[PDB]
C-alpha cells in the first residue's frame, strides 16, 4: 500500500494569515491526491480534487498544488470556521489511502472564562449520590487551572475534567469540572467552592454556594 | 439536498455478526458507485468497501473475507455485512458516494458522506443514562445572562446526542466530550447560555438519546 504522511501534525494561525500544509506519498501517485476537512463530530468534506481542481461551494480561499509525490494545500486567508483538520488522500493504487491529518488552531486574543456553579439536584440526591458542577465558558488559551474546595478544604481524587474542540464563531474553548460525592458525604459540609486560574485573570476566580441556602 | 441517511449505533460482542444500512435521498444507488469508510476513536480514515453499478464488489486485505457489501436499489438500500467483529472494528462507519472520474469504475474520492454509525465492540453490556438538570440559579449568571444544562450520567457505550427544544435552540450551547468514570461507564453534562429576564417565559428541554440502548429522555431544566 502506499503510505501517506503529513507534517507537521499540528499548526496553530492566527486569523487572515495564509497557511500551507503538506502531504507527501511514498511512491509516485500523479495528481491523484484530493483533499478532505473534517471537524468533530461531524464526518469528512471534499476540498479539492486530483491536486489542484475546485469544488462547487468550497471558498475559493482553499487550493492545492502539486505532482508525484509533494503535495501542498494553502488557505489564502485563514478563517475562523477554518479550524479543523485536513487529510490527503492518493487514488493512484488500490486500495485508496489517506494521511494521517494535519489539525489546524486559530490563535486568537487572550479571553478569561465566564465561571459558573451548578448544586446536584434533588432527583440525584434522591438516588443517593451528589455532582457538583463548575462551568468555564469561552476563553483562551486552553490551558485552565481548576481547584475544588469544600469547607475550605482543598480537593483531590473526586472530580472530573473536559474540555471542548475549539469554536468555529469565536475560537475560544469550555470546560466542565464535575465534583461527585455520595449524599452521606455531601450532608456533612455545607461550602462549596470552584477556584479558577487563567491567564486571562489578574486574580483568581471563585464561585461558590451553600447546600441548602 | 442530496445526502445520505444511516442506522444507529450499537454494541455488539466480539465474534457477532451485524449489518448496517444506508440510504439514499434524491440520488439514486443504481447510477453511482458506493462505498463504505470507517474511523477508529481518535484515528484516521479508512475505506472498508466498495461497489460499482455493475454490483461488483472491492474489499481491501484488512477486511476482506470477513466484510460484504450489497445493494438494493429498488428497496434504496446500501448494506455492510460484518462477521467475526473483535475490538479493532470498533469504529465510526460512513457510506460514501464515489466522484464524477476526470478519466474515462470508481474514482475512489467521495463527494458525498453519511452521518456515520458508531459501532462499539466489547464484552460489556448496554446501559441507558441518567438524565439530571443543571438548574439557572443565582450562581450561573453574569450580566443579564444565565446558564443551565442537563447531566448525563452513567451509560455505556458512546456516543449520547444532545439536543435543545427539538433541535430549534443551538446558538450558545456547549456539549462536553465524555469522561471515562472508574466503573467504565461514560458521562457528559449540556450546557447553554441564555437571557436571564426571560427565564420566566421561556421553556428550555434537553433531548438526550442513547440508540444503542433505545433510550430517548427529555428533561425539563426549571429554576430553583
Known amino acids: 500500500d502506499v503510505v501517506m504522511t503529513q507534517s507537521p501534525g499540528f499548526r496553530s494561525v492566527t486569523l487572515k494569515e495564509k497557511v500551507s500544509i503538506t502531504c507527501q506519498a511514498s511512491?509516485?501517485?500523479?495528481?491523484?491526491l484530493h483533499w478532505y476537512q473534517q471537524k468533530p463530530g461531524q464526518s469528512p468534506k471534499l476540498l479539492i480534487k486530483?491536486?489542484?481542481q475546485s469544488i462547487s461551494g468550497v471558498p475559493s480561499r482553499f487550493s492545492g498544488s502539486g505532482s508525484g509525490t509533494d503535495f501542498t494545500l494553502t488557505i489564502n486567508s485563514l478563517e475562523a470556521d477554518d479550524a479543523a483538520t485536513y487529510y490527503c488522500q492518493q487514488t493512484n493504487s488500490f486500495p485508496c489511502t489517506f494521511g494521517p491529518g494535519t489539525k489546524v488552531e486559530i490563535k486568537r486574543t487572550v479571553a478569561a472564562p465566564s465561571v459558573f456553579i451548578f448544586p446536584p439536584s434533588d432527583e440525584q440526591l434522591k438516588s443517593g449520590t451528589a455532582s457538583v458542577v463548575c462551568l468555564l465558558n469561552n476563553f483562551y488559551p486552553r490551558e485552565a487551572k481548576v481547584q475544588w474546595k469544600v469547607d475550605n478544604a482543598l480537593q483531590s481524587g473526586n472530580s472530573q475534567e473536559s474540555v471542548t474542540e475549539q469554536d468555529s464563531k469565536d475560537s475560544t474553548y469550555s470546560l466542565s469540572s464535575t465534583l461527585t460525592l455520595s449524599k452521606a458525604d455531601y450532608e456533612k459540609h455545607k461550602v462549596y467552592a470552584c477556584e479558577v486560574t487563567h491567564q486571562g485573570l489578574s486574580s483568581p476566580v471563585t464561585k461558590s454556594f451553600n447546600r441548602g441556602e | 439536498q442530496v445526502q445520505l441517511v444511516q442506522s444507529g449505533g450499537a454494541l455488539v460482542q466480539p465474534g457477532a455478526s451485524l449489518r448496517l444500512s444506508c440510504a439514499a435521498s434524491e440520488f439514486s444507488f443504481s447510477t453511482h458507485d458506493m462505498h463504505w469508510v470507517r474511523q477508529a476513536p481518535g484515528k484516521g480514515l479508512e475505506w472498508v468497501s466498495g461497489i460499482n453499478i455493475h454490483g461488483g464488489t472491492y474489499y481491501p486485505d484488512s477486511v476482506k473475507g470477513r466484510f460484504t457489501i450489497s445493494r438494493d436499489s429498488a428497496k434504496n438500500s446500501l448494506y455492510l455485512q460484518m462477521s467475526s467483529l473483535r475490538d479493532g472494528d470498533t469504529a465510526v462507519y460512513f457510506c460514501?458516494?464515489?466522484?464524477?472520474?476526470?478519466?474515462?469504475?470508481?474514482?475512489?474520492?467521495?463527494?458525498?458522506w453519511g452521518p456515520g454509525t458508531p459501532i462499539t465492540i466489547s464484552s460489556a453490556s448496554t446501559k441507558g443514562p441518567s438524565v439530571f438538570p443543571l438548574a439557572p440559579s443565582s450562581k450561573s449568571t453574569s450580566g443579564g445572562t444565565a446558564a443551565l444544562g442537563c447531566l448525563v450520567k452513567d451509560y455505556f457505550p458512546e456516543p449520547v446526542t444532545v439536543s435543545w427544544n427539538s433541535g430549534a435552540l443551538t446558538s450558545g450551547v456547549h456539549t462536553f466530550p465524555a469522561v471515562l468514570q472508574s466503573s467504565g461507564l461514560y458521562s457528559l453534562s449540556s450546557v447553554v447560555t441564555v437571557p436571564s429576564s426571560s427565564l420566566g417565559t421561556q421553556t428550555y428541554i434537553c433531548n438526550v438519546n442513547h440508540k444503542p440502548s433505545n433510550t430517548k429522555v427529555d428533561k425539563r431544566v426549571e429554576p430553583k
Open positions: 486530483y491536486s489542484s
Open positions: 460514501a458516494r464515489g466522484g464524477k472520474p476526470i478519466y474515462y469504475y470508481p474514482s475512489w474520492y467521495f463527494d458525498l
Open positions: 511512491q509516485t501517485i500523479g495528481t491523484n
